[PDB]
């Protein structure tokens, strides 16, 4: 799933 590190990941999409 998306990854928390990521910025942008986090900056569109909800940690998981």
Known sequence: ???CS???CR???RCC
Do not use: A
């Open 6 to 8: 990521s910025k942008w």
């Open 11 to 13: 900056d569109h999409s």
């Open 1 to 3: 799933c998306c990854n």
